[PDB]
Tab-separated table of C-alpha atoms in Angstrom:
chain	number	residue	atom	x	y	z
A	199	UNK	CA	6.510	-9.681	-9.324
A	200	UNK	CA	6.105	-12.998	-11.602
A	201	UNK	CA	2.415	-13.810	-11.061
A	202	UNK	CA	1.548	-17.966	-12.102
A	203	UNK	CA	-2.030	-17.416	-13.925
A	204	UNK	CA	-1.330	-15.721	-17.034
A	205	UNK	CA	-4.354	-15.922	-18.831
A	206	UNK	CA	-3.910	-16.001	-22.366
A	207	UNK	CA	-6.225	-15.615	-25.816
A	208	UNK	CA	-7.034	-18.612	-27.771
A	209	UNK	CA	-7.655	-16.244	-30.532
A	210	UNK	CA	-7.882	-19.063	-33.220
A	211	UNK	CA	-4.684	-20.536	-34.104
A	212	UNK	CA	-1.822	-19.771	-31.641
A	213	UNK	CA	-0.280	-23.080	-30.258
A	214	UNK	CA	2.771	-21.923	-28.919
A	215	UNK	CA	2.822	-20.260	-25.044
A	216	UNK	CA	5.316	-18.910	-22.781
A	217	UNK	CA	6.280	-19.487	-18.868
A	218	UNK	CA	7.232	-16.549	-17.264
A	219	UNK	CA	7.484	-18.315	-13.682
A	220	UNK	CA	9.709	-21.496	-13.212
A	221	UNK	CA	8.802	-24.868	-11.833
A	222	UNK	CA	10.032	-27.690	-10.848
A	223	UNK	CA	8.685	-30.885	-12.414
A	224	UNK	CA	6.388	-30.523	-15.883
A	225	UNK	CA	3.341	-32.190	-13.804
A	226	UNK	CA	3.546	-28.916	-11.515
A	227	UNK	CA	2.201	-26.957	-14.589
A	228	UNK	CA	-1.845	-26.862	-14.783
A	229	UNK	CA	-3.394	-25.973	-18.414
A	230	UNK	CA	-7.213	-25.739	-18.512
A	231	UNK	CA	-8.683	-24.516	-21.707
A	232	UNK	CA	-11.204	-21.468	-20.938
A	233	UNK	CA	-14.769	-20.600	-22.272
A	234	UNK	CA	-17.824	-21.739	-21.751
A	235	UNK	CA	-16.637	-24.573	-18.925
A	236	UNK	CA	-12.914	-25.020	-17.840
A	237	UNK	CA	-11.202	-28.482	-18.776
A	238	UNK	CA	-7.573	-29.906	-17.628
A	239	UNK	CA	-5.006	-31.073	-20.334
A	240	UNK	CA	-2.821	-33.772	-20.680
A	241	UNK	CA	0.797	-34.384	-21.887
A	242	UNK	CA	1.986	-35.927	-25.222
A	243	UNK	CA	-1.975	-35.391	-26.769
A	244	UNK	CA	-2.730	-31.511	-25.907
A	245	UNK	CA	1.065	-30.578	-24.066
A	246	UNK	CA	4.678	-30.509	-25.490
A	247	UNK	CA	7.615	-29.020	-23.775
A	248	UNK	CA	8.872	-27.817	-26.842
A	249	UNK	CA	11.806	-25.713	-25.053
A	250	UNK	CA	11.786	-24.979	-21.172
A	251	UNK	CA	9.048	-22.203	-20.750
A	252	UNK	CA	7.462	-22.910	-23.808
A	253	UNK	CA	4.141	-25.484	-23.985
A	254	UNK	CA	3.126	-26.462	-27.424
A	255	UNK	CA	-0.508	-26.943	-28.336
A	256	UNK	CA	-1.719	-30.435	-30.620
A	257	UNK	CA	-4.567	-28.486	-32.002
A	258	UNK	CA	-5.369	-25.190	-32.740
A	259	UNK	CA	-8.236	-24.751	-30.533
A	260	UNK	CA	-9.818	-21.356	-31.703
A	261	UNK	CA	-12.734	-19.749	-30.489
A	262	UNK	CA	-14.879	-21.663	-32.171
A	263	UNK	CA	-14.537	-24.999	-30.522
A	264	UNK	CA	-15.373	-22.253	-27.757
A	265	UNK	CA	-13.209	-21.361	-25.746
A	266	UNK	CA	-11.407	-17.898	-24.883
A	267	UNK	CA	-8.440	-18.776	-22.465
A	268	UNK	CA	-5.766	-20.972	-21.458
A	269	UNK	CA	-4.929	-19.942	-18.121
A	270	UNK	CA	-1.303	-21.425	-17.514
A	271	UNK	CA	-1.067	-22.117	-13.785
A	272	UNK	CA	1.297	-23.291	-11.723
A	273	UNK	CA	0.351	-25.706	-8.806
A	274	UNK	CA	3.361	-27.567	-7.221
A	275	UNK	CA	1.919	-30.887	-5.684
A	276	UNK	CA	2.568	-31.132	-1.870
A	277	UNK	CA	1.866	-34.793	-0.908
A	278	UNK	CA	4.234	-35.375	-3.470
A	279	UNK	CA	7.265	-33.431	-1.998
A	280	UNK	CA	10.356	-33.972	-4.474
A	281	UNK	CA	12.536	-35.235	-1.962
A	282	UNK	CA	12.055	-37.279	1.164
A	283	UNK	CA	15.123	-37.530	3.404
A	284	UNK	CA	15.884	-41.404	4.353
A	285	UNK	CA	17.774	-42.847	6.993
A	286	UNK	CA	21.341	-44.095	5.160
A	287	UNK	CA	21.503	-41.109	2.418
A	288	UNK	CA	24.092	-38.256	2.703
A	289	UNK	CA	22.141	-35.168	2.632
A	290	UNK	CA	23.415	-33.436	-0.058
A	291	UNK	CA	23.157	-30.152	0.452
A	292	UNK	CA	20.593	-30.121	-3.086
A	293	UNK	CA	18.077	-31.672	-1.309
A	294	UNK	CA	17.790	-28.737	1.016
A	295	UNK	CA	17.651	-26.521	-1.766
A	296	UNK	CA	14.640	-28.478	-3.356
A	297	UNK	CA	12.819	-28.612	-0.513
A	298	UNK	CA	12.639	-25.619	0.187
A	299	UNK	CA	11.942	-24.167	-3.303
A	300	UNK	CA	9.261	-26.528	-3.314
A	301	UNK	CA	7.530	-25.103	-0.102
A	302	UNK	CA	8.788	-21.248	-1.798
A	303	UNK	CA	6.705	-22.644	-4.638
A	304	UNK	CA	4.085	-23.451	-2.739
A	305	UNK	CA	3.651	-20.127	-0.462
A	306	UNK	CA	4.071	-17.843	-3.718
A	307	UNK	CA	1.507	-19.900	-6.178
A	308	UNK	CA	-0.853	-19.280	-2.565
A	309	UNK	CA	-0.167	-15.208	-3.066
A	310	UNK	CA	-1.023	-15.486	-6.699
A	311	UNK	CA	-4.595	-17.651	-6.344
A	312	UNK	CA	-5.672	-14.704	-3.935
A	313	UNK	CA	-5.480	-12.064	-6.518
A	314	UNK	CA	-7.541	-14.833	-8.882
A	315	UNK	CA	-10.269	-14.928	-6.434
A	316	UNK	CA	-13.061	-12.172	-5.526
A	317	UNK	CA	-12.292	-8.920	-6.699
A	318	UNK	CA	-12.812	-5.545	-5.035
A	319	UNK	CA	-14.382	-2.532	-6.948
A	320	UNK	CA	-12.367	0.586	-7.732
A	321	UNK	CA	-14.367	2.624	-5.489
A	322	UNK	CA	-13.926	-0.153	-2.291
A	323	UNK	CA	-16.937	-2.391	-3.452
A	324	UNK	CA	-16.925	-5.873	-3.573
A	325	UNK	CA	-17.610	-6.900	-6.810
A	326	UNK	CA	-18.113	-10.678	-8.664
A	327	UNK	CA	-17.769	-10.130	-11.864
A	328	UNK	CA	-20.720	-11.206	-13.162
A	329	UNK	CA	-20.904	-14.220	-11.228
A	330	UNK	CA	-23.704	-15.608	-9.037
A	331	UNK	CA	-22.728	-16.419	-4.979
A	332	UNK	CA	-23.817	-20.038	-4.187
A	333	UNK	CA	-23.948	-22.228	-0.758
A	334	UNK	CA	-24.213	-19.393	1.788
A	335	UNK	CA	-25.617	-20.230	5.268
A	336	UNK	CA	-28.969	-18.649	5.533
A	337	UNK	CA	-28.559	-17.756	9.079
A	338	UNK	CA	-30.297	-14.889	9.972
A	339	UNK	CA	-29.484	-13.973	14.133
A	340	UNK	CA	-27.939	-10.673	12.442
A	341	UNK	CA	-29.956	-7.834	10.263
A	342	UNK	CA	-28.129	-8.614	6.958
A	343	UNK	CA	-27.576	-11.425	4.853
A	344	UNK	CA	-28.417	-12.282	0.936
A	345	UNK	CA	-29.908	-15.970	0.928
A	346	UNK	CA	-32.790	-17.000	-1.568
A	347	UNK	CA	-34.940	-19.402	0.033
A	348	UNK	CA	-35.898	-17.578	2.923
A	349	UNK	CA	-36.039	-14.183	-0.001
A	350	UNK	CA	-39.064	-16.826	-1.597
A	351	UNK	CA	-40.497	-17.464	1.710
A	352	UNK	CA	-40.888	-13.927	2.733
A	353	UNK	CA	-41.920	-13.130	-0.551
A	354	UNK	CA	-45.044	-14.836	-0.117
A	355	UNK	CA	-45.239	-13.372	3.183
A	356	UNK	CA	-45.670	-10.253	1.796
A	357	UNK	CA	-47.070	-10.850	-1.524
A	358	UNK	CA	-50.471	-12.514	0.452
A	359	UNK	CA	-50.208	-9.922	3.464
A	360	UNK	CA	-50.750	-7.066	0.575
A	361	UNK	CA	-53.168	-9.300	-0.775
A	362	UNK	CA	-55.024	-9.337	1.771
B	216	UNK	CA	-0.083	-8.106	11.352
B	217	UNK	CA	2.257	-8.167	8.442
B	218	UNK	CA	0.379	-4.437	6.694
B	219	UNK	CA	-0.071	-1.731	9.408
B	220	UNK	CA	-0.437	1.443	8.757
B	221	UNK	CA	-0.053	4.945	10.064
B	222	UNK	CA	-1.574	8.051	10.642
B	223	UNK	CA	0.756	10.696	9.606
B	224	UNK	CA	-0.233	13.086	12.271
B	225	UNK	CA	0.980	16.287	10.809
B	226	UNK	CA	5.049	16.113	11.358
B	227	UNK	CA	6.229	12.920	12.930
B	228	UNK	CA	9.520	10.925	12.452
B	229	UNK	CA	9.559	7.102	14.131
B	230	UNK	CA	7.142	4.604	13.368
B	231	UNK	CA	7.546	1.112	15.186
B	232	UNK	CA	7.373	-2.364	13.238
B	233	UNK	CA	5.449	-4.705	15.152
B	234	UNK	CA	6.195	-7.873	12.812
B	235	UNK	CA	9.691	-9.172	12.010
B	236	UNK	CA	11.809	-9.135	8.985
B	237	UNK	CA	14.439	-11.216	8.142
B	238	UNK	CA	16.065	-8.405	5.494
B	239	UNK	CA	15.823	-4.650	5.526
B	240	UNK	CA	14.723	-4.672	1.633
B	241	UNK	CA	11.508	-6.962	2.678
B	242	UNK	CA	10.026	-4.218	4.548
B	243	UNK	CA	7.850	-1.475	2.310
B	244	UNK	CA	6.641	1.856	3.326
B	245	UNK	CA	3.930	3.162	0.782
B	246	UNK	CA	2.755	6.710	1.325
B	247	UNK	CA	-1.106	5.751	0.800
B	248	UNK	CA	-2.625	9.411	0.400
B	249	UNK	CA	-4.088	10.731	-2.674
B	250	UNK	CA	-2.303	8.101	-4.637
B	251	UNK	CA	-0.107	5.229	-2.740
B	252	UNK	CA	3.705	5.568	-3.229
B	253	UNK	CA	6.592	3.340	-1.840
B	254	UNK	CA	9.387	5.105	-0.955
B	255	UNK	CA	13.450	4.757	-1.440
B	256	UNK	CA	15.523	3.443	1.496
B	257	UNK	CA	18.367	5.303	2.659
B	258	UNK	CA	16.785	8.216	1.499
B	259	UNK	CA	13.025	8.600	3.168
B	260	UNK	CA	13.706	6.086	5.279
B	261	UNK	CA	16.889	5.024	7.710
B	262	UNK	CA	15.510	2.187	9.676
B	263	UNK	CA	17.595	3.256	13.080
B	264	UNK	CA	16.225	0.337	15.295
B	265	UNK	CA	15.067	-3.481	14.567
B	266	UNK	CA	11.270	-3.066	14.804
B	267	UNK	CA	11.690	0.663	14.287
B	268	UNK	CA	11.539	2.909	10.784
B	269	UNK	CA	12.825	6.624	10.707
B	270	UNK	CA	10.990	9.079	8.415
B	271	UNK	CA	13.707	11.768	6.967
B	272	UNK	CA	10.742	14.519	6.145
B	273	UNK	CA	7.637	15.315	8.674
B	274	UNK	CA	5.222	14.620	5.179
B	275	UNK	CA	2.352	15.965	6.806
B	276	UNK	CA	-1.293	15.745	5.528
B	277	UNK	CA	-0.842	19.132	4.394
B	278	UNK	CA	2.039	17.648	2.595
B	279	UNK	CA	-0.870	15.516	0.443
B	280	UNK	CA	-0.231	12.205	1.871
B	281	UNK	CA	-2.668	11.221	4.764
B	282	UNK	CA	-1.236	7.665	5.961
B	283	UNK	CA	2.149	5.173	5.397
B	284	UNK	CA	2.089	1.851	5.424
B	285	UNK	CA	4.829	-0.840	6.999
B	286	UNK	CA	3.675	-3.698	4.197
B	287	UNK	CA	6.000	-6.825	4.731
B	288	UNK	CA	7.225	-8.323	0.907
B	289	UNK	CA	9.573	-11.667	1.278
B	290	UNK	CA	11.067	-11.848	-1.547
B	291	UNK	CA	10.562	-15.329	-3.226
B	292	UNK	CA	12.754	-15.288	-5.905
B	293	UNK	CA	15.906	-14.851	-3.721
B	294	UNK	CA	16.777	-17.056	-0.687
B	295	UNK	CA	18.681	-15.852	1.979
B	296	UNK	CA	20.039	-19.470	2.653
B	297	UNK	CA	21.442	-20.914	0.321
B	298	UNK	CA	23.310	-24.259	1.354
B	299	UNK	CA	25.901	-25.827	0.010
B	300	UNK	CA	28.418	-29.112	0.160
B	301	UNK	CA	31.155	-26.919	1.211
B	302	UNK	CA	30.244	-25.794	4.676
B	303	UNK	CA	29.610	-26.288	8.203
B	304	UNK	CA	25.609	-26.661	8.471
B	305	UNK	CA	25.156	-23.714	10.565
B	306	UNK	CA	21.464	-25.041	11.993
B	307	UNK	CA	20.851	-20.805	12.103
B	308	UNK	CA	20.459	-21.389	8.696
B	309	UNK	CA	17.795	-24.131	8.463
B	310	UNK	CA	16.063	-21.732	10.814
B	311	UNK	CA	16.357	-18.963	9.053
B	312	UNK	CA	14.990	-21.074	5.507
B	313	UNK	CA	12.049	-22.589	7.419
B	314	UNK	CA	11.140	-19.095	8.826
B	315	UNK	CA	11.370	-17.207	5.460
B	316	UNK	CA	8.636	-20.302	4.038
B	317	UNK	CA	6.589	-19.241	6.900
B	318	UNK	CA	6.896	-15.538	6.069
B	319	UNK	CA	5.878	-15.921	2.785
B	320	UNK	CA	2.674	-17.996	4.098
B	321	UNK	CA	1.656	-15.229	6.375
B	322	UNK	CA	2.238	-12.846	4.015
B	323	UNK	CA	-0.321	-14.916	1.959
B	324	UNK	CA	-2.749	-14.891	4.087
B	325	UNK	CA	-2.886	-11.714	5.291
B	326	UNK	CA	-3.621	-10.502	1.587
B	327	UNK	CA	-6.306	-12.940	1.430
B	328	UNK	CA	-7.989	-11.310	4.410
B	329	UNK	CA	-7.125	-7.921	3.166
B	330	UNK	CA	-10.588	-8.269	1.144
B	331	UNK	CA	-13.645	-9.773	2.444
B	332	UNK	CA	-12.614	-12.165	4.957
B	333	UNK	CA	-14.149	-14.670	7.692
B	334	UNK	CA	-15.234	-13.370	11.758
B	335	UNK	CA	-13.862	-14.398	14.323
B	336	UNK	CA	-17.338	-16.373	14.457
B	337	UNK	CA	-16.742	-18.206	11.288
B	338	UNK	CA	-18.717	-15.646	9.196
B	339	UNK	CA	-17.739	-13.167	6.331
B	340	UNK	CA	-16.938	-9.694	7.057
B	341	UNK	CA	-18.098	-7.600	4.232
B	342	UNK	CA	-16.830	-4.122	6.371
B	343	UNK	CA	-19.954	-2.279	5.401
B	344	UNK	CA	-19.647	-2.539	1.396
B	345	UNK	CA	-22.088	-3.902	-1.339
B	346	UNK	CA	-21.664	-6.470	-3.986
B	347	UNK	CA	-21.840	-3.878	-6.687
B	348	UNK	CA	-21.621	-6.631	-9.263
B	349	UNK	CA	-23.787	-9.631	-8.461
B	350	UNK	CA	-25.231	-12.213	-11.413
B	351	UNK	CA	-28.779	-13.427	-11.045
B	352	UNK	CA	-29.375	-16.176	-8.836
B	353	UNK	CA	-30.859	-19.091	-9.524
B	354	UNK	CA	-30.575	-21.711	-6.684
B	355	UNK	CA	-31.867	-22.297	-3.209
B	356	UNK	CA	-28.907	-21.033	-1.229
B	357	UNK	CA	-27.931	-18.259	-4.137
B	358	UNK	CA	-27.390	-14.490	-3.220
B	359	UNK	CA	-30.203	-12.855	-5.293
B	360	UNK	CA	-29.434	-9.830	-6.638
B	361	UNK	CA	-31.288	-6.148	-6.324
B	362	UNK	CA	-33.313	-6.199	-9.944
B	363	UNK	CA	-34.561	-10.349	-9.215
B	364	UNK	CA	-36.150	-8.554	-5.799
B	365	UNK	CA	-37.300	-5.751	-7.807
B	366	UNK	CA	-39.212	-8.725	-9.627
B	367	UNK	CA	-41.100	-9.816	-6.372
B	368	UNK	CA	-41.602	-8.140	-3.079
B	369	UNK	CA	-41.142	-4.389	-4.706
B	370	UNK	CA	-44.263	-5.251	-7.101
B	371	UNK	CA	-46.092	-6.334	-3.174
B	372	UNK	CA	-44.280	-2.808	-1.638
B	373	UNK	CA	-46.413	-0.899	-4.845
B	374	UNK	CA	-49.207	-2.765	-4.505
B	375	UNK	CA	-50.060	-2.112	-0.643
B	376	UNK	CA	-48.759	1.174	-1.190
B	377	UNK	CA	-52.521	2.208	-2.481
C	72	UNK	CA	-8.861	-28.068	-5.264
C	73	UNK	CA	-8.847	-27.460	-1.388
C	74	UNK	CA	-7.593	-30.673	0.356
C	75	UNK	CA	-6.364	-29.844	3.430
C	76	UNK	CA	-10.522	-28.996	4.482
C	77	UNK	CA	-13.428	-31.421	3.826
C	78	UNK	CA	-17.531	-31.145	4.504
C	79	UNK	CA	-19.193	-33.974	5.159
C	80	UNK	CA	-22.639	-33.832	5.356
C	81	UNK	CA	-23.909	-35.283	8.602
C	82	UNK	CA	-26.783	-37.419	7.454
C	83	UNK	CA	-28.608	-38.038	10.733
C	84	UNK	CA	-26.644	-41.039	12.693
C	85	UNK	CA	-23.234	-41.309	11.140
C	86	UNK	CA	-19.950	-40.887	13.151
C	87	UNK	CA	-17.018	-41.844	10.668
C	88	UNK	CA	-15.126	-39.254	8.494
C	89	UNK	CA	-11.973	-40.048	6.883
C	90	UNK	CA	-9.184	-37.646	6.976
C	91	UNK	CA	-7.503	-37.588	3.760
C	92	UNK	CA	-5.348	-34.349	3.963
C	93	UNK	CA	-1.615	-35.515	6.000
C	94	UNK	CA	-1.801	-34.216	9.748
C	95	UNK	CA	1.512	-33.692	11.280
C	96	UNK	CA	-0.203	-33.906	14.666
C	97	UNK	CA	-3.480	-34.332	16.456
C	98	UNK	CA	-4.190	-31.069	17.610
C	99	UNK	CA	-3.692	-29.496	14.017
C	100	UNK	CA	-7.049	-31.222	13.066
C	101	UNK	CA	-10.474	-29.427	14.046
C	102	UNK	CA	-13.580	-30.334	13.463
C	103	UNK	CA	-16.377	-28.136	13.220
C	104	UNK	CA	-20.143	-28.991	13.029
C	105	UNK	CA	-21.711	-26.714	10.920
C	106	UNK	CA	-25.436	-26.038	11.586
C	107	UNK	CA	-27.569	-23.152	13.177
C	108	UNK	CA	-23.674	-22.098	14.940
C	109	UNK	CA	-20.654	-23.105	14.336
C	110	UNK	CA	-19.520	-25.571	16.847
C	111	UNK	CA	-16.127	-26.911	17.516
C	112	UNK	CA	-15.540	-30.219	19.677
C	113	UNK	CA	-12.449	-31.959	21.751
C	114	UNK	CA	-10.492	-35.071	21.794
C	115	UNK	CA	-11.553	-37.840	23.813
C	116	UNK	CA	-15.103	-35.610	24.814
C	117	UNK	CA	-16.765	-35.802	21.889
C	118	UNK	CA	-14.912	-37.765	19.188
C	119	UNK	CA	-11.802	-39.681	18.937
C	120	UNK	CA	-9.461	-41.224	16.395
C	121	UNK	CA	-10.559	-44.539	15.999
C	122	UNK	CA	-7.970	-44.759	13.821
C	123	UNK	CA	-5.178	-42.789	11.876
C	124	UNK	CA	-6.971	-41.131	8.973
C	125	UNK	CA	-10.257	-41.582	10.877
C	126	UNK	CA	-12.511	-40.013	13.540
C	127	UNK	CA	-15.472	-41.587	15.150
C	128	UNK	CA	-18.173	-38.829	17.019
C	129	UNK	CA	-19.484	-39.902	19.894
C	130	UNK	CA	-22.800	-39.152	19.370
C	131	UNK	CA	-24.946	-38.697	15.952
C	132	UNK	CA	-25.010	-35.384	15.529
C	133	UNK	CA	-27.889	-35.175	13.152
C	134	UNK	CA	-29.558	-32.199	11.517
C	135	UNK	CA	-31.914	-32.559	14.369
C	136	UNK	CA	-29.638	-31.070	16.414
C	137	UNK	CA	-29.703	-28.045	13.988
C	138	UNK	CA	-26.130	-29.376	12.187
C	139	UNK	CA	-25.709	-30.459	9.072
C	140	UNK	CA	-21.986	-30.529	7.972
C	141	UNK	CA	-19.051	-31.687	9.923
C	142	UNK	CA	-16.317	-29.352	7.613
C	143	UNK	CA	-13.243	-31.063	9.356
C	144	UNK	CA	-10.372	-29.187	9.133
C	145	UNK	CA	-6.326	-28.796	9.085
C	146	UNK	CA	-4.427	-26.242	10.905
C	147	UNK	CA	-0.843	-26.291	11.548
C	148	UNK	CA	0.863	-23.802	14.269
C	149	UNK	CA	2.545	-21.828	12.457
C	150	UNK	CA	4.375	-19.497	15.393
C	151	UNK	CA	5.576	-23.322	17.416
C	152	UNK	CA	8.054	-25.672	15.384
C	153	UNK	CA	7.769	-28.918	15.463
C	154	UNK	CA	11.054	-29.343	15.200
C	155	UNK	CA	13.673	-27.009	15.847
C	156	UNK	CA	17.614	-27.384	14.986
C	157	UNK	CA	20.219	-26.360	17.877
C	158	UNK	CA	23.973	-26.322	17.114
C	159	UNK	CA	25.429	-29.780	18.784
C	160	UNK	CA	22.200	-31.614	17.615
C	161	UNK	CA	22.488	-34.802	16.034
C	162	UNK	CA	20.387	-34.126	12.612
C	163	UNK	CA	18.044	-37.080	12.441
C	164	UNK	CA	16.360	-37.836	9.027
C	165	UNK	CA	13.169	-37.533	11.113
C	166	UNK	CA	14.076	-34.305	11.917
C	167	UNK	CA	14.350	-32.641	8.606
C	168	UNK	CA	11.380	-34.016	7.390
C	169	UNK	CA	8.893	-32.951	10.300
C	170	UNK	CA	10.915	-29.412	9.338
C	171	UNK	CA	9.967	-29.505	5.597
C	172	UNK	CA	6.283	-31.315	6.293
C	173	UNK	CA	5.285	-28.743	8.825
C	174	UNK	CA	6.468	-25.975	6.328
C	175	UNK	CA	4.824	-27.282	3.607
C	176	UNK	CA	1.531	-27.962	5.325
C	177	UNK	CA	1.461	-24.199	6.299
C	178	UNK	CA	1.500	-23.359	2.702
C	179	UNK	CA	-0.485	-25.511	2.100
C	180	UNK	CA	-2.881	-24.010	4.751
C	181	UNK	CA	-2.092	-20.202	3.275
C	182	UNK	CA	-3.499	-21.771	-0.022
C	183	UNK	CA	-6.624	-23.385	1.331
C	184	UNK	CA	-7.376	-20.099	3.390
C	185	UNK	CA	-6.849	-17.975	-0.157
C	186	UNK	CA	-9.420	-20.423	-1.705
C	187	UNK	CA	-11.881	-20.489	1.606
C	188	UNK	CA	-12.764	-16.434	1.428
C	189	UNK	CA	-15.475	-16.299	-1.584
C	190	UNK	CA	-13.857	-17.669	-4.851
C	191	UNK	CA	-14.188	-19.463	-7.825
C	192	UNK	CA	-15.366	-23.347	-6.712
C	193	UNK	CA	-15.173	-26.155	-9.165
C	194	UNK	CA	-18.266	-25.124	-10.886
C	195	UNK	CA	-17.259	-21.938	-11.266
C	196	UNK	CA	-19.565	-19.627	-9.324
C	197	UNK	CA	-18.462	-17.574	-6.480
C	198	UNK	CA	-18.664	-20.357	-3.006
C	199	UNK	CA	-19.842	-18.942	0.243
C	200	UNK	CA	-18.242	-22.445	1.109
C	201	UNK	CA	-21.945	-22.622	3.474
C	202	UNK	CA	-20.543	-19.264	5.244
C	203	UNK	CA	-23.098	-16.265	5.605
C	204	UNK	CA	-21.787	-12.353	4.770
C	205	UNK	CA	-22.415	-11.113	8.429
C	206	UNK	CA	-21.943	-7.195	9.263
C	207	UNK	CA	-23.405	-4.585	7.492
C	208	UNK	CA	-24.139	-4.098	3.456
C	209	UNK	CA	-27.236	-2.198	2.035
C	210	UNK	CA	-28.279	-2.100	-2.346
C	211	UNK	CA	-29.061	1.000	-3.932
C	212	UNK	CA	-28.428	-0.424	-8.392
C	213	UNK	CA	-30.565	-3.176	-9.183
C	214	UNK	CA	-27.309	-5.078	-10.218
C	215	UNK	CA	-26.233	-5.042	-6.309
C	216	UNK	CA	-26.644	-7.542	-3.957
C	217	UNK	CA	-29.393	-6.847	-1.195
C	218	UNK	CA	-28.985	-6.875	2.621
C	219	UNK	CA	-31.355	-8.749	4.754
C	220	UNK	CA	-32.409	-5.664	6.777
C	221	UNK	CA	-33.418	-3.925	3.540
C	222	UNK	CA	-36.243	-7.209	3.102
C	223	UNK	CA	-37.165	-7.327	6.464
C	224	UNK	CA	-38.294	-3.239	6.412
C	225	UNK	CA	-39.715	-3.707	2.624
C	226	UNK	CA	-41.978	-6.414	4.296
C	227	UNK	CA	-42.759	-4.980	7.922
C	228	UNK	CA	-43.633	-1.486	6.213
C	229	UNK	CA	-46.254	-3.380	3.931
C	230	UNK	CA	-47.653	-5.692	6.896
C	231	UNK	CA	-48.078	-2.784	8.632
C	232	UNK	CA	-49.348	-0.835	6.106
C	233	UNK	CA	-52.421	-3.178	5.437
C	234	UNK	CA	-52.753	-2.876	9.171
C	235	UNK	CA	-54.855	0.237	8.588
């Protein structure tokens, strides 16, 4: 019910932002500015955990150094699992509790990143937004597909055979 | 496998539930007709059997509702294990964690493929739709919209038309 | 952001690949050339692990031979454990952490599969990740994407058309 995108508005100066989902470690939360290109921030220069659940901006960052959206995500880092059970310990039973939040973590930031890619029209169309499809195979054994290079080469094909 | 759905078939009752559930709350029934509505437990429902659901009304197409659905939601918020200093280490219960991770993962999954989603030759299923929305293309490998054709080959499908 | 699936591209006679996404076994690592078809090989047939973290293909595998990309891949079984606890075990530190790898390489394969479908890619356009859109679609607004079939008739009709 707690989605782990929330896409906010720079709308000028705002440098105060909220959580709604919970993590684990501060490196598991993901803050890339929004606009005209996407770029990560760090800690201690564009980050402060003011409070739990609240990040704190260093600078304004309004529209006009262009940008739209800050895009909170959370992504909790699996090579580095929180806890890695060793030979002598005594297994507290915390350490089962961490791990497996941390895989929960894991499965329910994977539900969330499927609603944040390709949409599908209100009337069952697939539709992208206003972006532009790249790096599809141009293989053609079937009657339908939407590459560009063989679209150029045919073009000519039929440009020259009405030419003729 | 985790979303099937039904036919309502005029008056019916049972409905079987192929997947598994680890909690009776995790499964959802949504009456997908004109507009898709869950529906209470212990009221439109009654389970009666694991891998079984039990309708209390026929809700018949007539009724306004065409199909159900048997949509699997793990909750992820609340674990059904949770371990602690004080007890035995049943190993049901490491079981039970591990399997309620890999719940969650399917469930994942599944959604993805809900929409477009790859063959079983390693190629996208589009299920007879369009890319209403498509930006122009610009690159080698790009899909080119209808209007950047209408620029090219349309012009050549006028011009041999006379 | 994937990391659990990496294309190479072939470049005529190579055969080493690095594998830097953690496989909890062998068989939960295909490899697939990419070319003309989609091709996937075996162990000890047609490559091997030289060594962990590595595979050497035992033949070139060029784009001559109509492939281009080797897209290795991870895929963990998620229906067989692993590892699986009984009652009088023994509860090895191995034990629970094949358990909590193998669950969090799952997610971590629910998240790559979310990101492989057509989605936002680093540079922000919609990736066919060198996949083609294979049954059916046709265009009818100039905004929608075109079919293949729909190209082939608009240039058959006009070749045939100057035929007269």
């Amino acid at each position: 019910v707690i989605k782990t995108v929330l896409t906010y508005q720079l709308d000028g100066s705002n440098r105060d932002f909220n959580i709604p989902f919970e993590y684990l470690a501060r490196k598991f939360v993901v803050v890339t500015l929004i606009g005209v290109d996407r770029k990560v921030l760090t800690i201690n220069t564009d980050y402060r955990f003011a409070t739990r659940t609240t990040i704190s901006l260093t600078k304004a960052w309004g529209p006009a150094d262009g940008y739209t959206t800050i895009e909170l995500r959370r992504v909790t880092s699996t090579t580095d699992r929180l806890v890695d059970f060793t030979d002598g310990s005594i297994l507290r039973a915390y350490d089962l509790n961490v791990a497996q939040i941390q895989t929960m973590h894991v499965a329910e930031e994977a539900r969330d990143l499927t609603t944040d890619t390709i949409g599908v029209n209100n009337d069952g169309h697939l539709d992208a937004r206003g972006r532009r499809i790249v790096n599809l195979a141009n293989a053609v054994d079937d009657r339908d597909a939407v590459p560009f290079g063989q679209l150029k080469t045919m073009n000519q094909n039929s440009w020259q055979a009405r030419n003729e």
